[PDB]
Amino acid sequence: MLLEAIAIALTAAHFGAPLLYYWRAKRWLKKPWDVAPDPTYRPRVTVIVPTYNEAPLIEEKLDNIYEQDYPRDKLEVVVVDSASTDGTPSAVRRWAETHPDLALTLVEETERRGKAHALNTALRHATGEIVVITDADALWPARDTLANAVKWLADPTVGAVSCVKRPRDFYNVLRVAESKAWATPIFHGELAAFKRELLERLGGFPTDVGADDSHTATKIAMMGYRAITPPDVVCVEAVPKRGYHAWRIRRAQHLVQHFAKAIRDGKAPPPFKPILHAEAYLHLANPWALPTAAAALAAAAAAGSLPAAALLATGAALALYKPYRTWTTMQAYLIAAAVKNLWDKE
Ligand SMILES: Nc1nc2c(ncn2[C@@H]2O[C@H](COP(=O)(O)OP(=O)(O)O)[C@@H](O)[C@H]2O)c(=O)[nH]1
Numbered sequence: 001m002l003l004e005a006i007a008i009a010l011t012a013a014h015f016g017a018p019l020l021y022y023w024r025a026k027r028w029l030k031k032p033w034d035v036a037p038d039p040t041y042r043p044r045v046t047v048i049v050p051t052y053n054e055a056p057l058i059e060e061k062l063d064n065i066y067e068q069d070y071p072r073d074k075l076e077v078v079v080v081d082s083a084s085t086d087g088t089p090s091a092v093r094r095w096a097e098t099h100p101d102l103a104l105t106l107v108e109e110t111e112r113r114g115k116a117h118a119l120n121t122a123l124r125h126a127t128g129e130i131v132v133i134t135d136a137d138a139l140w141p142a143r144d145t146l147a148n149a150v151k152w153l154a155d156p157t158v159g160a161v162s163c164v165k166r167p168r169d170f171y172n173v174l175r176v177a178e179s180k181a182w183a184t185p186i187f188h189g190e191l192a193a194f195k196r197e198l199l200e201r202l203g204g205f206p207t208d209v210g211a212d213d214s215h216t217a218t219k220i221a222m223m224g225y226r227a228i229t230p231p232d233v234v235c236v237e238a239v240p241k242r243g244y245h246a247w248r249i250r251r252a253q254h255l256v257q258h259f260a261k262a263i264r265d266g267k268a269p270p271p272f273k274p275i276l277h278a279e280a281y282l283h284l285a286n287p288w289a290l291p292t293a294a295a296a297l298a299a300a301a302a303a304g305s306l307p308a309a310a311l312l313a314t315g316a317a318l319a320l321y322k323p324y325r326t327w328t329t330m331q332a333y334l335i336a337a338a339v340k341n342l343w344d345k346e
């Protein structure tokens, strides 16, 4: 009956860890920000939209950037497209001449070499103090979204700002709590704002990691700057429609590469090290504890004891309730990401 022991031990560990971490997040959450947004801070801003074959959405994406209240003499746009088959370059060119007061630079590249490479080239042609990366399928809900993020970058210790997303609460809590404590290791591509000096020390975006926003936020936090996601900087998450599950596992893959590579570079500031280690644990270790328990009880069930069959029937019965479904499928995504990662490289 020792596989029931190991099963309920592993289940207690797997579900115990995130809830203790959530409780420590909620005590950080009730401590006030040690940095302040400044509404008169007005630096030069470069918004970069990297695009590969997104001719449908990029006209309306440009219209969405165009409609920000942010003052236009301090705003410029670089649409970086590295050899798209669709007519995206002269779609942006067409729009570019329909909206002339908005400074636009379409830089085009020999050859597609991935998102980070495109971003790196766009960086050298950018003139702003703040660089905002945003995905072409991302739309900013308000006309002061951009200004809200910028207001949060005024403090010299804040190196990077990203948004809180809406369409779980637990996920958001971890974000803003880690932000208040020091930094959050997960940023969002819907809006990722960096100080150009910092990108330029790092320097630029490196090709090796999938989650460029989160990896850059994490290395800026490693340097002693704040990487934060304030609750009033909110974007809408762009859900893909096709291949929802493949899309979510590929995001999980980016997160697992990022956390695996991040923990292997020691020396985190004392405020960050518990955040970094907890998030890396939840992303690299805890998922495995789940299906190991499930297999322990499956073997215990098919042969022998079958209180284990009651435990798996209760597991399915708890798939009734939708937060359990969300959590278990996120763990599933993470496990698939780990194996897809290991066999992807060869
Ligand atoms: N220039 C360039 N842009 C890219 C490339 N790959 C992705 N992008 C852009 O990166 C943004 C996000 O890509 P997406 O496929 O939606 O990734 P996902 O949202 O995580 O599924 C989009 O605006 C794309 O246009 C690339 O190889 N070159």
Ligand SMILES: [Mn+2]
Residues within 6 Å of the ligand: 135, 137, 238, 240
């Ligand atoms: Mn997308």
